[PDB]
RNA sequence: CGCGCGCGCG
RNA sequence: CGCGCGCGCG
């Protein structure tokens, strides 16, 4: 849904996992639905033992929502 | 963030 | 004309 205004989800996760001594997350598009004029995307984020998904009206939004979810997973 | 070219839509 | 997608660049 929403990421905090002016926060950098993908870069923050990348920087966090580097400091935990983990390899960089892997992002893959794992779903696309709807017509070409109202598309929705799902990105999967994988790092260490975790797998979290994010979705959005664009791939960039989907990926940012995937990173946010992963940040929540790793920090909690 | 902004722009070009190409594609698909509406 | 927009939303999106691909490529590319600042």
Swiss-Prot record:
Residues 10-76 are annotated as: Sufficient for interaction with PRKRA. Residues 10-76 form the DRBM domain. It comes from the Eukaryota. Required for formation of the RNA induced silencing complex (RISC). Component of the RISC loading complex (RLC), also known as the micro-RNA (miRNA) loading complex (miRLC), which is composed of DICER1, AGO2 and TARBP2. Within the RLC/miRLC, DICER1 and TARBP2 are required to process precursor miRNAs (pre-miRNAs) to mature miRNAs and then load them onto AGO2. AGO2 bound to the mature miRNA constitutes the minimal RISC and may subsequently dissociate from DICER1 and TARBP2. May also play a role in the production of short interfering RNAs (siRNAs) from double-stranded RNA (dsRNA) by DICER1. Belongs to the TARBP2 family. Self-associates. Component of the RISC loading complex (RLC), or micro-RNA (miRNA) loading complex (miRLC), which is composed of DICER1, AGO2 and TARBP2. Note that the trimeric RLC/miRLC is also referred to as RISC. Interacts with EIF2AK2/PKR and inhibits its protein kinase activity. Interacts with DHX9 and PRKRA. Interacts with DICER1, AGO2, MOV10, EIF6 and RPL7A (60S ribosome subunit); they form a large RNA-induced silencing complex (RISC). Interacts with IRF7; this interaction prevents IRF7 phosphorylation and activation. This is RISC-loading complex subunit TARBP2. It comes from Homo sapiens. The gene is TARBP2.
């Amino acid at each position: 849904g929403l990421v905090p205004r002016g926060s950098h989800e993908v870069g923050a996760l990348q920087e966090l996992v580097v400091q935990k001594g983990w390899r960089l997350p892997e992002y893959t598009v794992t779903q696309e639905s709807g017509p070409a004029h109202r598309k929705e995307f799902t990105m999967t984020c994988r790092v260490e033992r975790f797998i979290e998904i994010g979705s959005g009206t664009s791939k960039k939004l989907a990926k940012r929502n995937a990173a946010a979810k992963m940040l929540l997973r790793v920090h909690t």
